[PDB]
């Protein structure tokens, strides 16, 4: 009976792990005449609307959204400790309420309810049921603020509707923010106005050559806004001064011996860089971010930083301290890869550590040091929350350079007590960042992104208490049927004892 249970699954089985779970009483079981009871507000009908659709097509009950009576399933707006992003599940014969001081809460509650449900919820035609929720009270809140997700659209460019795909699969365990990686050296991905050949050529072709693609402004601002209804702020990245042959290869006068580069097809990195010492080059960094800034109702502007080896040292710190001012100029915070922590980071900027257990301690100092400073630090180690990264030598797709990556290396870490040196409260939290040089299809992202992405939000959502692998396999083992009936494909690590 896995697909459909004769019993609930616990009220603790779901990721990632609430921080309070009070098991007891009887479950709620919904039925055909079940209506979801939301506040009179756009917002929490929003939500109502949402949780209906993931329910209808696996029920085949009418699940109508109402703003009055006393409806099976309950979503309340109201005062209570759960900040911004928190919620209070509670569940019996009387039914299921999901209380929280905001939507974002209502929004995570219900992506616990997805998970008390039986496997069978992610069919697409109706089925018997039980549609059983385990009887008790959830009181759920996050660790850190920052839980994000990156998609490399460059490397391999996937469409809005993929992307949407993608959000989907990352809303399922909470994170709150969508970092997209819109240019590097094998393709531009999104419009610029002022310089038009950045798109049209610039984004021609991708790895392994043949159509590359690109994102309008009207189609980025469907991304940003369907992101926005799964609750994730989107966090843009042009890469700078590194990783720009895209943007080189479409426009000679940005390179330093006037000449524009080739579209680049391959699979290596380092190569490229912005010319430094060229008066246009920040003409253009100016025009990119100011038109990506008008794009992005979100805080945050990221502008990479990575990988600049055909940058000297002199150059890239050069660059940063000209171009991180660009950011706030037009009123976004900078967000940089790790090396901007050598090259002075802005007051209020963050950087996102992609370093590894192997990295040597000057490195590491460097950003332990920026964190006393005040930087903010985002944590995603290469060989823990890569998500291209082979699980074993005989992996089909990814990369190896950071070595293996199984399902207890990327879990088993605490972001807090990370980074030697580094002040825990200097930890924004976490992202699990899926690069794209070996993956070009939908599926190929499942592959690489499951079983390990739920395992990343928890380390971001739930609380250090609450980390331990034995138990956490478990609840990640439970996962099998809802990915299966799902369509979603994932690898069956051995490591985890799958239901
Ligand atoms: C910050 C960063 O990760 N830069 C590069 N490092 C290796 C990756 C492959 O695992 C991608 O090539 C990525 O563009
Ligand atoms: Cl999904
Ligand atoms: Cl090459
Ligand atoms: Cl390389």
New binding site residues.
């Given amino acids: 009976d896995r697909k459909a249970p004769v019993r609930p699954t616990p009220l603790d089985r779901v990721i990632p792990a609430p921080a309070s779970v009070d098991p007891g009483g009887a479950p709620y079981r919904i039925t055909r005449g079940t209506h979801i009871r939301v506040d009179d507000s756009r917002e929490a009908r929003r939500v109502g609307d949402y949780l209906a659709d993931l329910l209808r097509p696996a029920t085949g009950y009418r699940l109508p959204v109402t703003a009055h009576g006393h409806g099976g399933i309950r979503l309340r707006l109201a005062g209570g400790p759960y900040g911004d992003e928190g919620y209070r599940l509670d569940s019996g014969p009387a039914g299921v309420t999901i209380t929280a001081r905001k939507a974002a809460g209502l929004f995570h509650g219900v992506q616990t309810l997805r998970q008390l449900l039986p496997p069978a919820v992610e069919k697409d035609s109706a089925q018997p049921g039980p549609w059983l929720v385990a009887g008790g009270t959830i009181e759920d809140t996050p660790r850190y603020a920052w839980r994000s997700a990156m998609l490399d659209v460059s490397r391999h460019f996937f469409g809005v509707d993929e992307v949407k795909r993608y959000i989907d699969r990352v809303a399922r365990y909470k994170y709150n923010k969508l970092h997209l990686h819109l240019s590097d050296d094998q393709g531009w991905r999104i419009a610029i106005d002022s310089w038009p050949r950045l798109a049209t050529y610039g984004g021609s072709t991708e790895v392994g050559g043949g159509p590359g693609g690109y994102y309008t402004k009207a189609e980025y601002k469907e991304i940003v806004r369907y992101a926005a209804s799964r609750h994730l702020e989107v966090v843009p990245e042009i890469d700078m001064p590194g990783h720009t042959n895209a943007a080189l290869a479409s426009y000679a006068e940005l390179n330093c011996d006037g000449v524009a580069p080739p579209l680049y097809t391959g699979?290596?990195?380092?190569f490229s860089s912005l010319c430094v010492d060229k008066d246009v080059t920040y003409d253009f960094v100016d025009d990119v971010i100011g038109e990506l800034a008008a794009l992005t109702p979100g805080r945050y502007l990221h502008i990479g930083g990575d990988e600049a080896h055909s940058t000297p040292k002199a150059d890239f710190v050069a660059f940063m301290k000209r171009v991180q001012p660009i950011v706030a100029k037009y009123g976004k915070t900078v967000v940089g890869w790790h090396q901007l922590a050598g090259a002075e980071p802005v007051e209020g900027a963050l950087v996102q550590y992609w370093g590894l257990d192997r990295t040597g301690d000057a490195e590491k100092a460097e950003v332990a040091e920026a964190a006393r400073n005040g930087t903010g630090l985002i944590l995603s180690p290469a060989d823990r929350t890569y998500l291209d990264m082979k699980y074993t030598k005989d992996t089909p797709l990814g990369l190896s350079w950071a070595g293996y990556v199984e399902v207890q290396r990327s879990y088993d870490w605490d972001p807090a007590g990370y980074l030697p040196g580094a002040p825990a409260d200097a930890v924004r939290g976490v992202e699990a960042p899926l690069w794209t040089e070996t993956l070009s299809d939908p599926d190929q992202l499942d592959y690489m992104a499951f079983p390990r992405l739920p395992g990343v939000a928890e380390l971001g959502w739930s609380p250090a208490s609450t980390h331990d692998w034995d138990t956490y396999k478990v609840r990640l083992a439970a996962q099998a049927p809802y990915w299966e009936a799902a369509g979603i494909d994932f690898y069956r690590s051995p490591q985890v004892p799958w239901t």
Avoid: E, H, L, S
């Fill in positions: 699979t290596k990195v380092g």
